[PDB]
Design a protein around this ligand. Structure first.
Ligand SMILES: COc1ccc(Cc2nc(O)c(O)c(C(=O)O)n2)cc1Br
Ligand SMILES: [Mn+2]
Ligand SMILES: [Mn+2]
Length: 137
């Protein structure tokens, strides 16, 4: 893949990703839930809210097939990744480029943003998973 899809890929698994992190401890969780009934969460150290969001996208790329829809609620994650694909058309640098490294090997990728905490089913589910034991209120 050298460019992102303009619309969702029909028949491709859709991963709803999210992350949460504790400001003081830097412990966080990154995870996904998909429309094929799969979920994964990993616990991370020395991380941030922004970094957990990128780590979640990494997990979705790692676990998905060659065509994949990924739905994030992170302005930062979408912005920073998009700032890459258009660029070749400083912070979390390694992780961003590792995501790009995964992206180019896919056949098709649709990456979309949705607003957090607005009752989007998949998004609410993954938010509940990653914030458990991480986000107080
Ligand atoms: C509409 O109400 C809200 C919308 C957003 C937020 C903050 C938030 N909460 C998350 O769980 C999350 O993943 C992200 C993010 O990635 O920016 N941002 C809190 C409320 Br109340
Ligand atoms: Mn989020
Ligand atoms: Mn969330």
């Amino acid at each position: 893949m050298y460019q992102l899809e303009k619309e969702p890929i029909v028949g491709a698994e859709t991963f709803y990703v999210d992350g949460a992190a504790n400001r003081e401890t830097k412990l966080g969780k990154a995870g996904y839930v998909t429309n094929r009934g799969r979920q994964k969460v990993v616990t991370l150290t020395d991380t941030t809210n922004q970094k957990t969001e990128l780590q979640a996208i990494y997990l979705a790329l790692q676990d998905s097939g060659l065509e994949v829809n990924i739905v994030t609620d992170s302005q930062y994650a979408l912005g920073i990744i998009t700032q890459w694909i258009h660029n070749w058309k400083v912070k979390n640098v390694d992780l961003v480029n590792q995501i790009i490294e995964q992206l180019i090997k896919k056949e098709k990728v649709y990456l979309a943003w949705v607003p957090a905490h607005k009752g989007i089913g998949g998004n609410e589910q993954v938010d509940k998973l990653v914030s458990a034991g991480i986000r107080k209120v």
